[PDB]
Design a protein around this nucleic acid. Structure first.
Ligand SMILES: Nc1ncnc2c1ncn2[C@@H]1O[C@H](COP(=O)(O)OP(=O)(O)OP(O)(O)=S)[C@@H](O)[C@H]1O
Ligand SMILES: [Mg+2]
Ligand SMILES: [Zn+2]
Ligand SMILES: [Zn+2]
Lengths: 613, 623
DNA sequence: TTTTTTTT
């Protein structure tokens, strides 16, 4: 056959890079041949794929091998796999076989990782076709894993000659001429499913990131393909980097299974479609188990702010560092992010522990910046404007793809996390009702379109509206000062109503603060804690499970009685007591106390009292 | 010899003439062809323009050579080659590219410069001819024009994502594995019937390996025919020009660009299954060169000289709308918006765009619409529309195929936008506009379509008071009757009124009548004005100043003390920034803040605005 | 179903 002496040279260099790499940071520069050690671990677990750092092979042999493979990855891949099999035979001959009946050949997936750079979706070019690259972006769509037919096998339906180890092209391929020279069967190739080996496969769609080419352009999208262990390796709707080769997808319909090339196809033309074949995938976007996940210094820092007793106030201060004032509102953020203990009673009734906050401020109150910080600083956080939004896009949508199927809405896109709702006032009343039922149920059911599916839809909602007429009439009542269905009002945990004040001192302070925010830009802000530090502490608190206390039971019952008397009930109901308990849970989580404290209930009582105004 | 089939255009003589046109072509040839003997500069003119370009091109190492028609029409040897190209472009351009490559090779070897001749040999040198012919209406095109360069002007409606453009076919034997590469000739493949190795010569064993094959990059762009070219009879047409190579992805949507390219037509399969082709032919164009709609040291000198002039502020204000009579304050405000503020993209807290937003609410007949037309003409990225003819969906984003269509705002992102009859524009679409201008970004939330888009663009709204004529009896806010939030969103609001001032009426009538006198009737050169504004935006970057910040604090405290939303503070901040930019200042100054406040009061007519009742005394207005 | 001008 074709010598491809360069190919076999690359094979040899690749096996020598896999076995004689002789590099290891463990025990300082002491060489372990980390690829030989990875082969040893491979024997321990008997996987298929081999993780290969691009930088390792780059330092290997001056990176000439890295360059060659990175360009002609497609051409070199069979040689690389053959060399990997040779290495396995050398050191892990057991793994050389799949490893009872006969064990077939084991396929090894060379999933290179840690590439030098990531090229953006628009950076993609035909020049890179077949070259190993890495692409970043969020996963807009995915596919159910399905068994691509890697190696095919067919029984000759005229002589029974069985074929095997037939690689398939994009279109389902079949043997052309019977291997049995005596036989002359050119069709009738009953696929031997048992003999043939199928690899797992999954289509995945991604879109351009916001700060990628935002300049006057719609975010470009790419169809990457997951194979082998990579399948399902990443969750949907998350920014991740995919390393692999650029694959050109010919139209199978043209293959037969502007114009296109022809005269091969034969008379038929052929139109292509570029795509990407991911080899390795990396995402970039218990209390004791969480601590284990943390680094030693990270655990120390955790303990450090745990020891701090002002920690509560400093955290509240850290919230929305750019935003000035409205400290109670920042406290509301913190508490909602912490959430509350969700529980289902013995009777089974589910009791939500989440907190759905609502904000009613005049324009320019920076509520927009408020939500921007919230979502940006919040995982599982979705931001949307009520004025421009569709119910299905917000909760869930039904689409037909070969065939009726479903598409997650904002609630799904952020279920079990923050749900920012900007311009809520402008939001459609019917859509508001859809959310109402969905959030109250903590569940979304797609009854329509024939299908009757249902999804968890559990999450927290940060409603953001403006008072009717762009201004809150203090003479009027919250219910009436803003257009919104009262029952949904009942299930909004909080209502931060933002008013204007002519306090000259406050005006001067805020003006100076803004002007500094522009002068010194980032230098102006200085929260007590870093956002990553804040998130680590927050998750640690999430790990906590507050427990109610006898004194707390009492304090709660008297405080609820006092609230009922205060309204004496347009805004005071059993829902208010439920929110009181949830706020107590959130405060304890901020206090990182497994038990509730009447002080915590006092804080929550003051919070709700202020919300009442 | 080497001749072009069907043309009697000798490739050898063509090559010799174009070579002599490459070296020994003084720019003097061009300028003399353009006459302008009063403007001839020896250095430039005596310079072998194309030789200097080739030297600078080797220094840059690019393989593309922009080329005007006039240079060819100036060199007697290549004057004929000009018409040859006009008639039979493809072959002429191929020969010309080969000649440029050979000339670069000669230059490096002749100049014995230390350069990789292989690189130049590897460099696929191309020529990007432009100005080939007078811009002709695209609708005017007819079949015989095919196979010729057609200079064209239009607006980019939309562009396709780059497509793999099959370049060279790669085959492989299925019995001995021997491989061969078939170059795509005429967009088709002539597969080898048997193996290239006569040793094997297996029939049909040669199979095309798609991945191993070579592909190029192609893109297609819909280009609207400009309203100037089209007649009143029918709507403008558009052509999906096919772009290739670097030219691919070389323009966004809404790009007023002039392009030269060969006129191309092709058959279309009547039945995809069969080879039967419809008698009529699909037609496209391959752009050899694209023209979009460097500040020379002389240009910078002129810019800085004008900046030296004290009248700079008022001079630009009048220059932007020379024909308009009076309205200097409105002109100045829109001039500032054209300049725009500073986009301090904070790493935290989000980005803070220095955008300026001006609405024009006032009694009609005031030329507000004419002013909008001017603004749209001036801004390189302009978006003119009227509320009645506008839809919120079409304004920002329209679902399509699942795919999204850029809205008017999207077409303005990074430019100025014009919304005529803004008051008439629906309140719902108003709400749509609110957040997008506030965040300078479009947020999308729909079934299967949920994302956000950049919308950093200025909007110039034209409204009319609820009372057709502004009623001073009604408070200014009532006269405008616009959402208080929306009202705040806008940065400036000029309350133009048609005060009956016999003197001003006389003067305006004189202006209009004088205009009438001349059948076809100081101020900066609009081109030089645009260059000034650009250079200011790109190079100048105003930064707040200590005195400026103190004055801003005190001023906004007074405002709120007398309502003064925080957006008012940001507005005066960005306005002082744009003022400093107008003054070519990278640092803000107290005087910029003073001017910002002065113009803020002017547009609202605060001088004549009643301290109470929210009304304005018409007598005080313009005194 | 979802989005969508347009008329009814
Ligand atoms: N100061 C002015 N200088 C020059 N022309 C003016 C002036 N004021 C009004 N005009 C003319 O008056 C006419 C009014 O045109 P428009 O642009 O429609 O006025 P307008 O201010 O936009 O008010 P509308 O559009 O009716 S709400 C035009 O012919 C203008 O040229
Ligand atoms: Mg007008
Ligand atoms: Zn057989
Ligand atoms: Zn062969």
């Amino acid at each position: 056959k074709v010598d491809d002496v360069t190919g076999e040279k690359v094979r040899e260099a690749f096996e020598q890079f896999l076995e004689d790499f002789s590099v290891q940071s463990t025990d300082t520069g002491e060489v372990e041949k980390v690829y030989r050690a990875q082969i040893e671990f491979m024997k321990i677990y008997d996987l298929n794929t081999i993780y290969i750092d691009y930088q390792h092979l780059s330092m290997r042999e001056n990176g000439a091998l890295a360059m060659a493979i990175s360009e002609q990855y497609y051409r070199f891949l069979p040689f690389l796999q053959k060399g990997l099999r040779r290495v396995v035979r050398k050191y892990a001959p057991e793994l050389l076989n799949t490893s009872s009946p006969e064990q077939t050949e084991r396929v090894f997936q060379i999933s290179f990782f840690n590439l030098p750079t990531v090229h953006r979706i628009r950076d993609i070019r035909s020049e890179k076709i077949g070259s190993l690259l890495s692409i970043s972006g969020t996963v807009t769509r995915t596919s159910e894993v399905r068994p691509e037919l890697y190696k095919a096998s067919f029984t000759c339906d005229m002589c029974r000659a069985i074929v095997d180890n037939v690689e398939q092209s994009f279109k389902y391929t079949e043997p052309t001429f019977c291997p049995n020279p005596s036989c002359e069967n050119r069709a009738f190739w009953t696929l031997n499913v048992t003999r043939s080996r199928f690899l797992d496969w999954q289509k995945v769609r991604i879109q351009e990131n916001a700060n990628e080419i935002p300049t006057g352009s719609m975010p470009r999208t790419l169809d990457v393909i997951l194979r082998g262990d990579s399948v399902e390796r990443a969750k949907p709707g998350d920014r991740c980097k995919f390393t692999g080769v650029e694959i050109v997808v010919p139209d199978v319909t043209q293959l037969g299974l502007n114009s296109g090339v022809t005269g091969l196809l034969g008379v038929r033309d052929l139109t292509y479609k570029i795509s990407f074949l991911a080899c390795h995938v990396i995402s970039i976007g218990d209390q004791e188990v969480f601590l284990n996940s943390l680094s030693s210094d990270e655990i120390n820092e955790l303990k450090e702010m745990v020891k701090d007793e002002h920690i509560y106030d400093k955290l509240v201060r850290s919230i929305a560092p750019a935003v000035f004032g409205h400290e109670a509102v920042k406290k509301g953020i913190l508490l909602q992010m912490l959430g509350g203990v969700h529980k289902s009673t013995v009777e089974g009734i589910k009791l939500r522990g989440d907190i759905n906050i609502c904000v009613v401020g005049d324009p320019s109150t920076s509520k927009s910046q408020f939500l921007k910080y919230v979502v940006g600083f919040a995982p599982r956080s979705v931001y949307t404007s009520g004025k421009a939004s569709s119910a299905a896009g917000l909760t869930a949508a039904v689409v037909r793809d070969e065939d009726y199927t479903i598409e997650a809405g904002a609630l799904m896109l952020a279920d079990n996390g923050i749900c920012c709702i900007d311009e809520f006032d402008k939001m459609d009343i019917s859509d508001q009702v859809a959310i109402h039922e969905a959030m109250e149920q903590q569940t979304i059911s797609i009854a329509k379109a024939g299908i009757h599916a249902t999804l968890n839809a559990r999450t927290s909602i940060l409603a953001a509206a403006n008072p009717v007429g762009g201004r809150y009439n203090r003479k009027l009542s919250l219910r009436g000062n803003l257009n919104m269905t009262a029952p949904i009002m009942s299930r909004f945990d909080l209502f931060f109503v933002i008013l204007d004040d002519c306090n000259e001192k406050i005006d001067t302070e805020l003006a100076s603060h803004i002007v500094d925010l522009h002068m010194k830009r980032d230098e102006a802000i200085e929260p007590p804690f870093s956002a990553e530090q804040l998130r680590r502490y927050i998750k640690y608190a999430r790990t906590f499970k507050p427990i109610l206390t006898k004194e707390a039971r009492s304090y709660l019952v008297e405080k609820y009685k006092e609230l009922r008397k205060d309204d004496a009930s347009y805004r005071i109901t059993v829902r208010q007591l439920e929110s009181m308990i949830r706020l107590s849970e959130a405060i304890a989580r901020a206090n990182c106390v497994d038990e509730i404290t009447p002080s915590f209930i006092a804080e929550a009582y003051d919070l709700l009292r202020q919300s009442i105004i | 010899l080497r001749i072009i089939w069907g043309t009697n255009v000798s490739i050898q003589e063509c090559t010799t003439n174009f070579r002599n046109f490459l070296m020994s072509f003084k720019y003097k040839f061009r300028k003399i062809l353009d006459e302008r003997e009063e403007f001839i500069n020896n250095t430039t003119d005596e310079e072998l323009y194309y030789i200097k370009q080739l030297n600078e091109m080797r220094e840059l190492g690019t393989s593309n050579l922009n080329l005007d028609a006039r240079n060819l029409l100036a060199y007697k040897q290549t004057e004929d080659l000009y018409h040859q190209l006009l008639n039979y472009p493809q072959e002429v351009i191929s020969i010309m590219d080969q000649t440029i490559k050979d000339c670069m090779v000669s230059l490096i070897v002749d100049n014995n410069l230390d350069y990789d001749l292989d690189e130049i040999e590897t460099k696929f040198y191309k020529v990007r001819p432009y100005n080939v012919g007078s811009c002709k209406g695209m609708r005017e095109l007819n079949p015989n024009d095919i196979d010729k360069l057609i200079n064209l002007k239009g607006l980019v409606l939309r562009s396709t994502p780059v497509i793999p453009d099959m370049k060279v076919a790669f085959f492989k034997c299925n019995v001995c594995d021997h491989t061969m590469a078939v170059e795509i000739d005429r967009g088709v493949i002539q597969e080898p019937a048997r193996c290239e190795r006569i040793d094997c010569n297996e029939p049909n064993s040669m199979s095309l390996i798609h991945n191993r094959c070579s592909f190029a990059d192609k893109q297609v762009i819909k280009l609207q025919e400009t309203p100037d070219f089209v007649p009143d009879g029918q709507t403008p047409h558009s052509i999906s020009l096919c772009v290739y190579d670097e030219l691919v992805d070389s323009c966004r949507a809404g790009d007023r660009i002039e392009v030269t390219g060969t006129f191309r037509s092709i058959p279309i399969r009547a039945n995809s299954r069969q080879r039967v082709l419809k008698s009529l032919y699909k037609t496209y164009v391959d752009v050899v060169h694209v023209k979009k709609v460097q500040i020379t040291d002389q240009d910078l000198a002129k810019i800085r000289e004008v900046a030296a002039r004290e009248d700079l502020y008022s001079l630009l204000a009048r220059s932007i709308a020379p024909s308009i009579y009076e309205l200097e304050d409105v002109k100045k405000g829109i001039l500032l918006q054209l300049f725009g503020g500073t986009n301090k993209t904070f790493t935290k807290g989000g980005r803070y765009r220095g955008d300026i937003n001006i609405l024009l609410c006032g009694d009609p007949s005031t030329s507000k619409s004419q002013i909008l037309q001017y603004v749209h003409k001036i801004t390189p990225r302009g978006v003119y529309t009227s509320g009645k003819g506008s839809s919120a969906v079409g304004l920002t984003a329209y679902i399509t195929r699942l795919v999204l269509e850029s809205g008017a705002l999207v077409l303005s992102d990074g430019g100025v936008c014009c919304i005529d009859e803004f008051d008439k524009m629906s309140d719902s679409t108003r709400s749509v506009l609110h957040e997008v201008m506030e965040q300078q970004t479009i947020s999308i939330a729909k079934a299967g379509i949920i994302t956000t888009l950049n919308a950093r663009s200025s909007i110039l709204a034209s409204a009319n008071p609820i009372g057709s004529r502004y009623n001073p009896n009604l408070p200014v806010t009532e006269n405008i009757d616009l959402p208080p939030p929306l009202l705040s969103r806008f940065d400036l609001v000029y309350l133009v009124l048609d005060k009956v001032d016999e003197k001003n009426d006389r003067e305006l009538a004189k202006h209009l009548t004088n205009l009438y006198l001349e059948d076809k009737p100081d101020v900066l050169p609009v081109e030089f004005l645009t260059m000034y504004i650009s250079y200011a935006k790109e190079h100048i970057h105003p930064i707040i100043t200590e005195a400026a910040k103190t004055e801003l604090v005190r001023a906004y405290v007074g405002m709120r003390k007398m309502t003064a939303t925080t957006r008012q503070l940001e507005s005066m901040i960005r306005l002082a920034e744009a003022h400093a930019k107008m003054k070519l200042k990278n640092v803000v100054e107290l005087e910029d803040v003073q001017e910002a406040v002065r113009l803020i009061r002017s547009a609202i007519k605060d001088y004549a605005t009643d301290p109470k009742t929210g009304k304005i005394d018409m007598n005080l207005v313009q005194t």
